[PDB]
Amino acid sequence: ARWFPKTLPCDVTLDVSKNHVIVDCTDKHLTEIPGGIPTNTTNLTLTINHIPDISPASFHRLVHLVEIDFRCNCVPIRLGSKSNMCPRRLQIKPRSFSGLTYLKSLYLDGNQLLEIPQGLPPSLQLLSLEANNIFSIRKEQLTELANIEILYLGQNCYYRNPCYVSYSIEKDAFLNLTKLKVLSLKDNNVTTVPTVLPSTLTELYLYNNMIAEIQEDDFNNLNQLQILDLSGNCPRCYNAPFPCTPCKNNSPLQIPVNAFDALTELKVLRLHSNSLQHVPPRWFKNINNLQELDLSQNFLAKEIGDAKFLHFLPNLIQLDLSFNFELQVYRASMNLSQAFSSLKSLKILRIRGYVFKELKSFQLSPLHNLQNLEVLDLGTNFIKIANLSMFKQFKRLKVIDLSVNKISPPQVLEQLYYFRYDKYARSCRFKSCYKYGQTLDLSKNSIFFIKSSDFQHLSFLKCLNLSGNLISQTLNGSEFQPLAELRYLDFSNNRLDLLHSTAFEELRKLEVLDISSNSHYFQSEGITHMLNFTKNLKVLQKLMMNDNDISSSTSRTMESESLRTLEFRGNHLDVLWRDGDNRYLQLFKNLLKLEELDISKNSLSFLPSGVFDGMPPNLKNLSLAKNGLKSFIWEKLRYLKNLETLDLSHNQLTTVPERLSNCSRSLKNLILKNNQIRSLTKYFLQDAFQLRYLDLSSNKIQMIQKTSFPENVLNNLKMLLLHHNRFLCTCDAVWFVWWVQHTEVTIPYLATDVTCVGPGAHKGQSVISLDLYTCEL
Amino acid sequence: ARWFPKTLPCDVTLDVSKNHVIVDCTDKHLTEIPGGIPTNTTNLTLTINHIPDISPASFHRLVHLVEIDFRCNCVPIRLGSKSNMCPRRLQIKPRSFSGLTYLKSLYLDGNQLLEIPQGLPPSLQLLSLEANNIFSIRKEQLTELANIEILYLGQNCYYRNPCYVSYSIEKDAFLNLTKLKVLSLKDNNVTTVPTVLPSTLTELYLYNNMIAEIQEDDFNNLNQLQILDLSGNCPRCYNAPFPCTPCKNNSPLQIPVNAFDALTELKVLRLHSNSLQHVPPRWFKNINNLQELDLSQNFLAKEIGDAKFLHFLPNLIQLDLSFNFELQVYRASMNLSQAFSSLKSLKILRIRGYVFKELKSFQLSPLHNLQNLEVLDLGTNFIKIANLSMFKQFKRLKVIDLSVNKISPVLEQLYYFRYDKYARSCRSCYKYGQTLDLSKNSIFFIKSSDFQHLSFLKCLNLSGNLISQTLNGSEFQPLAELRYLDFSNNRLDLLHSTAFEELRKLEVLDISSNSHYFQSEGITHMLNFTKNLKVLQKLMMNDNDISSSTSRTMESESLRTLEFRGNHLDVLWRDGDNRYLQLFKNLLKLEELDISKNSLSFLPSGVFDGMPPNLKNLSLAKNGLKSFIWEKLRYLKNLETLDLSHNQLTTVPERLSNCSRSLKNLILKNNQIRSLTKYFLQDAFQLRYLDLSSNKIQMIQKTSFPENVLNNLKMLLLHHNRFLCTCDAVWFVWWVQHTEVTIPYLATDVTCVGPGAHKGQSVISLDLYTCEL
RNA sequence: UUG
RNA sequence: UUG
Ligand SMILES: *[C@@H]1O[C@H](CO)[C@@H](O[C@@H]2O[C@H](CO)[C@@H](O)[C@H](O)[C@H]2NC(C)=O)[C@H](O)[C@H]1NC(C)=O
Ligand SMILES: *[C@@H]1O[C@H](CO)[C@@H](O[C@@H]2O[C@H](CO)[C@@H](O)[C@H](O)[C@H]2NC(C)=O)[C@H](O)[C@H]1NC(C)=O
Ligand SMILES: *[C@@H]1O[C@H](CO)[C@@H](O[C@@H]2O[C@H](CO)[C@@H](O)[C@H](O)[C@H]2NC(C)=O)[C@H](O)[C@H]1NC(C)=O
Ligand SMILES: *[C@@H]1O[C@H](CO)[C@@H](O[C@@H]2O[C@H](CO)[C@@H](O)[C@H](O)[C@H]2NC(C)=O)[C@H](O)[C@H]1NC(C)=O
Ligand SMILES: Nc1nc(=O)c2ncn([C@@H]3O[C@H](CO)[C@H]4OP(=O)(O)O[C@H]43)c2[nH]1
Ligand SMILES: Nc1nc(=O)c2ncn([C@@H]3O[C@H](CO)[C@H]4OP(=O)(O)O[C@H]43)c2[nH]1
Ligand SMILES: *[C@@H]1O[C@H](CO)[C@@H](O)[C@H](O)[C@H]1NC(C)=O
Ligand SMILES: *[C@@H]1O[C@H](CO)[C@@H](O)[C@H](O)[C@H]1NC(C)=O
Ligand SMILES: *[C@@H]1O[C@H](CO)[C@@H](O)[C@H](O)[C@H]1NC(C)=O
Ligand SMILES: *[C@@H]1O[C@H](CO)[C@@H](O)[C@H](O)[C@H]1NC(C)=O
Ligand SMILES: *[C@@H]1O[C@H](CO)[C@@H](O)[C@H](O)[C@H]1NC(C)=O
Ligand SMILES: *[C@@H]1O[C@H](CO)[C@@H](O)[C@H](O)[C@H]1NC(C)=O
Ligand SMILES: *[C@@H]1O[C@H](CO)[C@@H](O)[C@H](O)[C@H]1NC(C)=O
Ligand SMILES: *[C@@H]1O[C@H](CO)[C@@H](O)[C@H](O)[C@H]1NC(C)=O
Ligand SMILES: *[C@@H]1O[C@H](CO)[C@@H](O)[C@H](O)[C@H]1NC(C)=O
Ligand SMILES: *[C@@H]1O[C@H](CO)[C@@H](O)[C@H](O)[C@H]1NC(C)=O
Ligand SMILES: *[C@@H]1O[C@H](CO)[C@@H](O)[C@H](O)[C@H]1NC(C)=O
């Protein structure tokens, strides 16, 4: 097909509509900007390389650049790899950017720069210098940024990237940047709010600094400000996972009552970790539009019981009062002020880490009439007692979250969220059952025993999360009787005792059941387990039974008219299917609608004959990955007449079938990565017209000849993976080298990991760049 | 040193006292008996190879052989590898053994043999033909075994190795084997006890067969028999993990009341899985010496409550009545007959799988006066209730085992349910004193009074319960003598630094696999709880996912071993955060620290300085370590063992001696090392063990590996590298061929990878004369 | 690779 | 390899 092979070690994309030529050289172990970058290049990304300098020659030809992303070519020592530390800061020579008349966005984050780079074109809207070593801002260094709208300067002086002094900002440094919308000075050891800021700011980020006091006029002119973040100034340091220095005398960040008076447009106020003890209502006198308020990680335990300020927040969407508990105090109950009832717009309330013994219905009465309330998060509260029936008054909610408690008789937050330093930190790369309906999340509690009356009045629930409790009982179909509407039960990380084949049958509308990581009782010999419990679940679509160490079953067959997906990863089918024992060879046969089966990680070093014949007739998607498979009778695929995806990754296979078409007419996706294949059979893919995806990566293949890979098949492939093999680039490889260079077929990692290993001369050389003319003399 | 390199791909060992020359060729991927086997060879082992034939030429020179072990050179299809199936049964030519005048023991197990091999010498005392295809025994084929004392014939016809007929034994086939002591016909599809057996038998194994009936005279003459095993005839098949066919009519193995009358010497009787419903006392009328009786996997639930037969067993040491429960019956309690009191010699009583709701003190009264009772096993009984205090009447016992029950206020894990627990392959806190094992119960909450009257306990096993409480040092008050607590696989909440402090005599604490509360942010954990445990020697806190700690230091005057595998020291030691760099410093007598599997891709500076002063043994394995500042080992002045296995290191120190003068054992296996530094081992005289296996080393020169060091090494591991066998390698190849230093796998995995000619060739066999022209 |  |  192609007349001119692509040798450039970067992905090139065309977006004809937006007039964009996108060149992505992310993480290509470059020590130089590569030659041959298209002249029409608009967006060039060189992040995570080791290019030690920029010069007028760097971008000479590239006069149409709108965006240069040159991040993380010299990451500060403690932020970067300890195996490849950058020896000297990036050097930017004069005039490197002044010729780029159309340049809108420049990212120079993570390059150990000492100063704001000069000579930047007046087109620039966005400049980013995070994770550098710039800790003095002078008005004179900013005159070049007349048109700048977005300026990121954070992470230039903090514990991971120290500068060993206070940050310095000259008076009025930013004032004459008349179009500046977004200013970020986070994580920078700043001691005062810099003034005067231009009145065009929409977003101001001042968090994780050393600001002890806000002056009453610090935000006087910012009548367009929408987002203000002052978090992590006078931090609450208890159990902090980073070095944390509090303000002296347990002082809060001191905020005058009239500090916010000019912020009539403010939508987001973030006061996380400011050691606040009071929230004066006078703060919010002139902010009628505030939508999001974060007051997490303070000392507002008393204030939550008073909270006059809430009367001024009728448009608030999101309130977070998490982790406000008094140290070494365990309150008897949660005292929510009546003032919460005035939060007419509230969709999301989070109050983790209040820390109290007993939740009772009346304590939530202030919320009964919040019509728009969607999420109530009372996680990580060490609640010992809670009658779940109280949530009958909360049918309108999408999520009731009691995760991480001590109870016994629409996006999830990262596992580190309230305690991390900077949850918005940008990486060097880049720049759940809620969907089923009403969710009650009781995960990570101390529930040892359940009975029907625990769920009295909760028939509206679509999802119940019981993950990570202590449930050890012989469920018999009597325990969830009220849960008539339940579509999803997550029962993972309990100790299910499957003595009874009637377990879960009362959940007549159950579509998905997760009983993964319930291995306990499956580890002891002589215990009766009824894997045939599936028969009674008439609308079950998906069953997850992973990591259960299942090596025995009293019943011989699982049956279902409905089940489409079975995850059975991390069990011991090798023990059930011991060579000579026929009894379990039809375990899955009567799952008549099953399409997806995952039996990876079952220590299946071989498959006894009868396994494939025993498969249910409509199996589409089979994983046998990570089994230590040392042999495989390819012909047995003939029994799986609807097989579309076969995953055999991470095994010990040494051969492919002589003729894949003769094994399976239906197979579309063949994953063979991470095996021990050293050669392909002569006619491997001959007439395999249905094949669309083939992964032969991370094998030991030396040679590939034309006969194995006919062109009428290769042309149908959406992707062919060949990387990390042992290719021999001798004159015997002429066809393969030619074909790789010239094909239109998508083959990933040509630039990094489709490499000759030999002979001598060409060792470590990309096959895409290989010249074999000496073979044609 | 050596003048003649050892090229034979087998270990050769000398035992001068017994005049033995031991040649072990186990698992050497041989397809031929190797040449050059010493002429003086007495014991030759060729197990797990693919040698397709034996012939007169096989052992011609080896006239002094006493033992040939030639097992598993052609394993039956379903018993063997499916990746290397044996194509044709072993072929044994005539006269292969008749020249071996001194041959005492021949093992030919696992070779797909169809017949008993003939032409065996009259010296033979032991013949073994397990896992063959010999399923008809003819008197004529046994005449050659006049002097045989031990004959193994089992596993020749069973579900893993089927013969598709009944086993056949001709009448009196064994009678004229006048010195036969041990006969094993297990796992063979035998239908009747073969008769007449010789009266010299000490041991008869007939288990896992199809014997429905014992005739009254089957064992008439066996007045020397010590062990009889008839188990697995009319099996109890409930929840069996193998294909199991019961006797028709739910029948037991039928044993007439006088069948054992002649067995005056019997010490062991095994009647496991015989579907017995009754144990007639008349069985044991003439056996006063029986010591071991296994009656597990029967239907003797009612019989346990009666059990008149026990009155005839005053010398019994070991009784097993495990897995005798009636299907779908969950008894209220355990009914032990008063007859148990007559078992004056009993050391070990096992009654798992009785299956009952509540154990009460009175129910064990029949045992109160068994003076020698050492082990009481009531595991896998689904007991819901048991007052632990009842065991105050049992201080004399070594182990009280309530493992796998349902209580709430060592045998292989498969034992009672496996087919043949004595099958031959081709190739714990009891020690501390009184042990109460409550592992795998449903204990959610504990308090001091649960342990009332149990102050004598030395080991308590609470492993695999549901304990989720903030232990505060009040919960084990009575357990004043406890030396070992296994608290693994619970949900310890380490809120309180006073946890466990009441166990004033605790030497070992295991709180491994208590990760639960360590997985959620904002929870207070006090790792400094070690301070209060004044005699603690060993602390195991593996697989706890520990990534946060309210306290900054662990302290102990006593602790010698800390296992901290499978945690998140990488998070505690984030580059820039100094606060936890002395976590272990104040464990002043610590000698062994295991911080493998802590995702430590690098070690921040200060880690080594923060190590306690007497550290001898440090594991940093399986951390994905990509770099390592070897010079920092200077801080570990007492370091003897450094384990850096399974990492991504690419280099060794320029000079190991300049890093550590104390280091004896350096484990670097499974890294990415491609070359050694020029002077690597110069003057590191006290180095004794070096493992460089599974790396990418191409060349090793004498400067890196001076001989004044290498010769002192007890072991040097080099296998699975990328050795380039050019003329540059002359020294290394010479030294490897000639050294006395132990180097494992020379015969199998110390290989050239090039150039061309020598690719895949063993370094030990490499001829490099062309380099010396 | 006699489980 | 800014968490
Ligand atoms: C190419 O560069 C331009 C400008 O740097 C990018 O345009 C930005 O796109 C994002 C989309 O998330 C918008 O939010 C910004 O407001 C745009 N800025 C400008 C000045 O146009 C464009 O995204 C880049 N394209 C690629 C593929 O990287
Ligand atoms: C933030 O600035 C403070 C000073 O305002 C820095 O603290 C100084 O650090 C040097 C070296 O650590 C010391 O000699 C001085 O004693 C410190 N002064 C004070 C007042 O504490 C601090 O290092 C800066 N933080 C970072 C991470 O760079
Ligand atoms: C070498 O072969 C002899 C002969 O088979 C072995 O000696 C026997 O070892 C068994 C195993 O415990 C003893 O119980 C016998 O009493 C020994 N004597 C005889 C004559 O059988 C000897 O152990 C073998 N040595 C090795 C290391 O394999
Ligand atoms: C043990 O012997 C029995 C016969 O007593 C074998 O069973 C016969 O096997 C063939 C083939 O499976 C059948 O056609 C016969 O009907 C069987 N006879 C009976 C009486 O069942 C059995 O296969 C043998 N067991 C093993 C493991 O080899
Ligand atoms: N798994 C299980 N959990 C129990 O709680 C139980 N109680 C009695 N039993 C009996 O023990 C036998 C082995 O588990 C089971 O078989 P059963 O005779 O039907 O009755 C069962 C229990 N089994
Ligand atoms: N780990 C733990 N387990 C508990 O059961 C508990 N109850 C209250 N608390 C309090 O919650 C805080 C966060 O773990 C702890 O700090 P405290 O305020 O000293 O008291 C503790 C508990 N902590
Ligand atoms: C709740 O707390 C506030 C503290 O401001 C207190 O004034 C109020 O009376 C408390 N109410 C209850 C029900 O405890
Ligand atoms: C839980 O509250 C409900 C009413 O919502 C009531 O029916 C039930 O009895 C309560 N249960 C307990 C144990 O308090
Ligand atoms: C249930 O909770 C666990 C633990 O919090 C979480 O990992 C899991 O994703 C949740 N399950 C669903 C279905 O959302
Ligand atoms: C299930 O268990 C409950 C426990 O109270 C019992 O009422 C019910 O009868 C049991 N179900 C069956 C099928 O026995
Ligand atoms: C499951 O199998 C058992 C036999 O082991 C049978 O008695 C029980 O009724 C079966 N249950 C279903 C739903 O098939
Ligand atoms: C096959 O199943 C796996 C999970 O087992 C899934 O990730 C994958 O997308 C499926 N493939 C197709 C083609 O549906
Ligand atoms: C495989 O190959 C042979 C020859 O084309 C043919 O006879 C046989 O039917 C084929 N089987 C399948 C399932 O394609
Ligand atoms: C357990 O037995 C002891 C006597 O050994 C007694 O002191 C205690 O009260 C008993 N516990 C219960 C709950 O009956
Ligand atoms: C405690 O019981 C567990 C679970 O059976 C067992 O694995 C462990 O080895 C026992 N602990 C000790 C210290 O022997
Ligand atoms: C620990 O908790 C116990 C049991 O609830 C409590 O009564 C006691 O005061 C505490 N003990 C110690 C040693 O602090
Ligand atoms: C452990 O550390 C905490 C504070 O971090 C302290 O309150 C406690 O007393 C310490 N305990 C011991 C035993 O050192």
Dihedral angle at the C-alpha atoms of A127, A128, A134, A135, nearest 10 degrees?
90
- φ, ψ of residue B319 to 5 degrees: the values are -125, 130
How far is it, in rounded angstroms, from Cα B649 to Cα B644?
Answer: 9
Residues in chain A within 8 Å Cβ distance of B401: none
CA distances from A577 to A428, B144, B170 (A): 48, 41, 36
Beta strand A375-377 with A719-721 is unpaired
How far is it, in rounded angstroms, from Cα A170 to Cα A164?
Answer: 19
How far is it, in rounded angstroms, from Cα A396 to Cα B95?
Answer: 90
**Strand partners of residue B127:** B106, B151
Q: Which ligand 1 atom is nearest residue A125's CA?
A: 20
Helix (H, G, I), strand (E, B) or coil at A12: strand
Resolution of the experimental model in angstroms, please?
2.3
A227: its two tokens: 């987002």
B82: its two tokens: 């499916």
Nearest CA to ligand 1 atom 25: A43
HEC secondary structure over B447-491: CHHHHCCCCCCCEEECCCCCCCCCCCCCCCCCCCCCCEEECCCCC
**Strand partners of residue B229:** B205, B270
Residues in chain A within 8 Å Cβ distance of B575: 77-79, 82, 160
Q: B67 CB under 6 A from ligand 3?
A: yes
Chains A, B: CB contacts under 8 A, how many? 132
Closest C-alpha to A545, from A506, A592, A587 = A587
**Cβ atoms < 10 Å from Cβ of B599:** 15
| Rg for chain B, CA atoms, rounded | 32
Dihedral angle at the C-alpha atoms of B80, B82, B87, B88, nearest 10 degrees?
20
Give the nucleotide at minimum CA-to-C1' distance from A131: D2
State, as a whole number of angstroms, the distance between the CA of B94 and the C1' of C1.
27
Nearest CA to ligand 9 atom 7: A467
How far is it, in rounded angstroms, from Cα A693 to Cα A645?
Answer: 9
Ligand nearest to the CA of residue B387, numbered in listed order: 14
Closest C-alpha to A136, from A87, A169, A109, A97 = A169
The DSSP line for B506-544 is --EEE--S--GGGGSTT----GGGGGG-TT--EEE--S-
Q: Which ligand 11 atom is nearest residue A532's CA?
A: 1
State, as a whole number of angstroms, the distance between the CA of A374 and the C1' of D3.
29
Ligand nearest to the CA of residue B238, numbered in listed order: 5
Q: Is the CB of A28 under 7 A from strand D?
A: no
Residues near B588 by beta carbon (within 8 Å), at least 6 away in sequence: B556, B557, B612, B613, B614
A225: its two tokens: 């400000």
Cis-peptide, bond into residue A279, ω within 30° of zero? no
**Strand partners of residue B586:** B555
CB A95 within 8 A of CB A118: no
| Residue A509 CA to ligand 9 centre (angstroms) | 20
DSSP annotation of B559 reads: -
State, as a whole number of angstroms, the distance between the CA of A241 and the C1' of D3.
13
**In residues, how long is chain B?**
773
Chosen from A78, A83, A323, A630 to mutate, greatest number of chain B CBs within 10 A:
A83
Closest C-alpha to A695, from A623, A599, A603, A629 = A623
CA A405 and chain centroid, separation: 25
CA distances from A639 to A90, A611, A635, A665 (A): 61, 10, 9, 11
Q: Is the CB of B232 under 7 A from strand C?
A: no
Identity of the residue numbered B490: N
Q: Is the CB of A48 under 7 A from strand D?
A: yes
A11: exposed, middle or buried (Cβ count in 10 Å: 0-12, 13-18, 19+): middle
Closest C-alpha to A197, from A213, A219, A212 = A219
Q: What share of chain B is helix, strand, coil (3-state, %, to 5)?
A: 15, 15, 70
CA distances from A692 to A635, A636, A716, A722 (A): 20, 21, 6, 15
Residues 144-183 of B with CB under 7 A from strand C: 154-155, 160
Residues in chain B within 8 Å Cβ distance of A82: 575, 601-602, 626-627
List bases, strand D, within 7 Å of protein CB. 1-3
Please, what sign has the CA dihedral across residues B587, B588, B590, B596? positive
B612: its two tokens: 């306690």
Which runs of E-coded beta strand occur in B267-374? 268-270, 292-294, 318-320, 348-350, 358-359
Q: Is the CB of B549 under 7 A from strand C?
A: no
Residues near B654 by beta carbon (within 8 Å), at least 6 away in sequence: B677, B678, B679, B680
CB A576 within 8 A of CB A529: no
Q: What share of chain A is helix, strand, coil (3-state, %, to 5)?
A: 15, 15, 70
Dihedral angle at the C-alpha atoms of A754, A758, A759, A763, nearest 10 degrees?
80
Give the nucleotide at minimum CA-to-C1' distance from A242: D3
CA distances from A444 to A95, A158, A351, B528, B568 (A): 59, 35, 17, 25, 21
CB A96 within 8 A of CB A54: yes
A615: exposed, middle or buried (Cβ count in 10 Å: 0-12, 13-18, 19+): buried
B393: exposed, middle or buried (Cβ count in 10 Å: 0-12, 13-18, 19+): middle
Is residue B59 within a helix (H) or strand (E), and if so which, with residue range? helix B56-59
How far is it, in rounded angstroms, from Cα A266 to Cα A228?
Answer: 8
Beta strand B484-486 with B555-556 is unpaired
Helix (H, G, I), strand (E, B) or coil at A621: strand
**CATH class as words, domain B1-773:** alpha beta
Beta strand B20-24 with B11-15 is antiparallel
B513: exposed, middle or buried (Cβ count in 10 Å: 0-12, 13-18, 19+): buried
**Cβ atoms < 10 Å from Cβ of B46:** 26
Q: Which ligand 3 atom is nearest residue B20's CA?
A: 1
How far is it, in rounded angstroms, from Cα B596 to Cα B612?
Answer: 17
DSSP annotation of B399 reads: E
**In residues, how long is chain A?**
777
List bases, strand C, within 7 Å of protein CB. 1-3
**Strand partners of residue A465:** A441, A490
The DSSP line for A432-470 is --GGGS-EEE--SS------GGGGTT-TT-SEEE-TTS-
How far is it, in rounded angstroms, from Cα B122 to Cα B118?
Answer: 11
Cis-peptide, bond into residue A21, ω within 30° of zero? no
CA distances from A738 to A56, A702, A741, A747 (A): 36, 16, 5, 14
Closest C-alpha to B513, from B463, B458, B473 = B463
Q: B237 CB under 6 A from ligand 6?
A: no
How far is it, in rounded angstroms, from Cα A748 to Cα A9?
Answer: 11
- φ, ψ of residue B215 to 5 degrees: the values are -75, 155
Q: Considering only alpha carbons, which residue of chain B is nearest residue A240?
A: B522
Residues in chain B within 8 Å Cβ distance of A627: none
Residues near A411 by beta carbon (within 8 Å), at least 6 away in sequence: none
**Cβ atoms < 10 Å from Cβ of B385:** 14
Residues in chain B within 8 Å Cβ distance of A652: 83
CB A465 within 8 A of CB A433: yes
Is residue B229 within a helix (H) or strand (E), and if so which, with residue range? strand B227-229
**Cβ atoms < 10 Å from Cβ of A666:** 12
How far is it, in rounded angstroms, from Cα B322 to Cα B416?
Answer: 8
* CATH topology assigned to domain A1-777: 3.80.10
CA B622 and chain centroid, separation: 24
Residues near A332 by beta carbon (within 8 Å), at least 6 away in sequence: A356, A357, A358
Identity of the residue numbered A79: L
CB B666 within 8 A of CB B657: no
Q: Considering only alpha carbons, which residue of chain A is nearest residue B240?
A: A526
How far is it, in rounded angstroms, from Cα A624 to Cα A509?
Answer: 31
A647: exposed, middle or buried (Cβ count in 10 Å: 0-12, 13-18, 19+): buried
Q: Which ligand 10 atom is nearest residue A476's CA?
A: 1
Q: Considering only alpha carbons, which residue of chain B is nearest residue A444?
A: B516
CA distances from A369 to A396, B226, B485, B736 (A): 11, 84, 53, 84
CA distances from B266 to A402, B97, B182, B220, B372 (A): 65, 36, 14, 13, 21
Nearest CA to ligand 7 atom 14: A335
Q: Is the CB of A232 under 7 A from strand D?
A: no
The DSSP line for A34-82 is PTT--TT--EEE--SS---EE-HHHHTT-TT-SEEE--SSS--TTTS-S
CB A516 within 8 A of CB A547: yes
Q: Greatest CA separation found in chain B? A: 92
Binary contact (B239, A520; C-beta < 8 A): no
How far is it, in rounded angstroms, from Cα A529 to Cα B239?
Answer: 9
Shortest distance, CA B154 to any CA of chain A (angstroms): 17
Domain ranges of chain A: 1-777
| Rg for chain A, CA atoms, rounded | 32
Ligand nearest to the CA of residue A402, numbered in listed order: 9
Beta strand A669-671 with A693-695 is parallel
Closest C-alpha to A184, from A430, A425, A418 = A425
Chosen from A525, A549, A607, A631 to mutate, greatest number of chain B CBs within 10 A:
A525
| Residue A280 CA to ligand 5 centre (angstroms) | 62
Cis-peptide, bond into residue A194, ω within 30° of zero? no
Method of elucidation: X-ray
Chosen from B79, B81, B82 to mutate, greatest number of chain A CBs within 10 A:
B82
Nearest by CB to A159, from B82, B547, B576: name it: B576
Q: Is the CB of A131 under 7 A from strand D?
A: yes
Identity of the residue numbered A472: S
How far is it, in rounded angstroms, from Cα B353 to Cα B299?
Answer: 11
State, as a whole number of angstroms, the distance between the CA of A79 and the C1' of D1.
7
Tokens 């005279």 found at = B217
Residues in chain A within 8 Å Cβ distance of B626: 81-83
**Cβ atoms < 10 Å from Cβ of A761:** 9
CB A58 within 8 A of CB A90: no
Mutate to test the pocket of ligand 13, among A640, A658, A661, A662 (most ligand atoms within 8 A of CB): A662
How far is it, in rounded angstroms, from Cα B349 to Cα A731?
Answer: 76
Q: Which residues of B sit in the known binding site for guanosine?
A: 382, 406, 493, 524
